[PDB]
């Protein structure tokens, strides 16, 4: 590694909203918290769900009973 070429590459702390503290070595030179991390994203938490496809049948039965 050349000496006077690269920026300052120091160690900082990445803290998420849930409190997941990650020791990351970056060029930041300061600690900055994050709003979402790998453990809080809906896709990797399993909360992404689906677009629900279509429910007109359901909707019609919820809307109109139509006895008989």
């Amino acid at each position: 590694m050349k000496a006077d070429i690269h920026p300052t590459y120091e160690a900082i702390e990445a803290t998420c909203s849930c409190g997941n503290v990650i020791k990351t070595r970056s060029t930041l030179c300061k600690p900055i918290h994050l709003d979402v991390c790998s453990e809080c994203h809906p896709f990797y938490t399993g909360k992404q769900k689906v677009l629900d496809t279509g429910g007109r049948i359901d909707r019609f039965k919820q809307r109109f009973g139509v006895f008989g």
């Binding site: 709003d35 677009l51 496809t53 279509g54």
Partner: protein, 110 residues
């Protein structure tokens, strides 16, 4: 990333949340009333503590990346069925029943 998308600064909370693309003006007022954030203060003056609550509120209505997907799927449901409402939609004519003889220029350009 800030709340799902980048939010402007030097503006009130309700106006700032309007750019979330899925919360308008009235629902933004309800989110602020539920959370407790005062709209009178700028988003700059707010702390980084209740923004998690604002994100939780955003995560219970919709996000734009899925709102556009599902509204496009709703359009597709009409477009793949044979209905007249989609028949005019594909060609780009007015859908709700506006007059087509003249001045249907928003859906056809210059």
């Amino acid at each position: 990333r800030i709340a799902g998308v980048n939010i402007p600064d030097n503006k009130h909370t309700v106006i700032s949340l309007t750019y979330i693309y899925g919360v308008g003006r009235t629902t933004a007022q309800s989110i602020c009333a539920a959370t407790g954030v005062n709209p009178a203060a700028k988003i700059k003056d707010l702390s980084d503590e209740q923004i998690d609550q604002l994100r939780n509120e955003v995560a219970k209505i919709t996000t734009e990346g899925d709102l556009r997907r599902e509204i496009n799927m709703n359009i597709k449901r009409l477009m793949d069925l044979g209905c007249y409402r989609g028949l005019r939609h594909r060609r780009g004519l007015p859908v709700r029943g506006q007059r087509t003889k003249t001045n249907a220029r928003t859906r056809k350009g210059p």
